[PDB]
From a paper:
HAPLESS 2 ([name]) is a conserved sperm plasma membrane protein that is essential for gamete fusion in a diverse array of eukaryotes. [name] is homologous to the viral class II fusion proteins, which fold into an articulated rod made of three β-sheet-rich domains, termed I, II, and III, with the central domain I flanked by domains II and III in the prefusion form. Domain III connects to the C-terminal transmembrane domain via a flexible linker, while domain II bears the fusion loops at the opposite end. The crystal structure of the C. reinhardtii HAPLESS 2 ([name]) ectodomain (CrHAP2e) revealed that this broadly conserved, gamete-expressed transmembrane protein has the same three-dimensional fold as class II viral fusion proteins. It was proposed that, like its viral counterparts, [name] initiates gamete fusion by insertion of fusion loops into the opposing gamete plasma membrane.
Residue numbers in the entry: 99 to 126, 129 to 214, 257 to 367, 371 to 382
Write the structure that this text describes.
């Protein structure tokens, strides 16, 4: 007669997020950062053949990094002063092999069959669910729910205009103030890979994981009419 309490949330696809974006450095004719296909990083294009703004990266020369103790250790410009002075180095935003699908979530809707509940349903509205989506044949994609991640929307940059957030893109990468006097790889911190790695390490240390979906509970994704559901511990009142 009695059934278990169920909590379902509607899933809303947002975009694909790269697991670990990285900065490729190209040694240099000379360094070209012009909005043309002649650029060192090269121009990226949408499926319509339109150039993606800020995709050509930027060049960095020694510059004021010449002056002892002005630029921080490991900065873009400083690397030119030391190994390639006179020349310029291209900073290119590149995307890793692995990609995740980002889903926004709605409100929890209770379910039963034969009122105050035992456990209160978790707020998933202000969070985002990440599921490995490509290259498909990849270990992580095959690994299923084990590899899903759940982050607060605060850690996500939807449009990619914000540095050190999930979904960071060309707009945030160039457009960094004083970019050449900044550390190599700046802006590409706190990514999905970092969120996973931080959990796996803390887990091996016998600590509480905070990002992977498994630390939130055991879920089920059904393609009805798509929803994300979990079973509440306990029973009806």
């Amino acid at each position: 007669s009695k059934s278990r309490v169920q909590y379902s949330y509607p899933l809303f696809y947002e975009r694909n997020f790269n697991a670990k974006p990285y900065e490729e450095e190209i040694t240099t004719v000379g360094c070209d950062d012009t909005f043309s296909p002649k650029a060192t990083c090269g121009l990226a294009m949408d499926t319509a053949g339109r150039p993606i703004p800020y995709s050509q990266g930027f060049c960095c020369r020694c510059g004021p990094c010449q002056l002892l103790g002005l630029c921080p250790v490991g900065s873009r410009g400083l690397q030119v002063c030391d190994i390639f002075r006179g020349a310029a180095l291209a900073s290119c935003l590149r995307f890793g092999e692995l990609w995740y699908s980002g889903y926004s979530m709605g409100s929890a809707t209770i379910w039963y069959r034969l009122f105050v509940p035992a456990e209160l349903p978790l707020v998933l509205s202000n969070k985002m669910l990440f599921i490995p989506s490509s290259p498909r044949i990849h270990e992580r994609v095959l690994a299923g729910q084990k590899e899903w991640l759940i982050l607060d929307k605060h850690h996500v940059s939807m449009q990619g205009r914000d540095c050190n957030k999930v979904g960071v893109s060309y707009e945030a990468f160039s457009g960094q103030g004083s970019r050449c006097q900044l550390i190599r790889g700046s802006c590409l911190a706190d990514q999905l890979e970092d969120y996973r790695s931080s959990d796996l390490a803390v887990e091996a240390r016998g600590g509480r994981g905070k990002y992977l979906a498994r630390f939130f509970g055991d879920f089920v994704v059904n393609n009805v009419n798509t929803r994300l559901s979990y079973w509440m511990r306990g029973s009806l009142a």
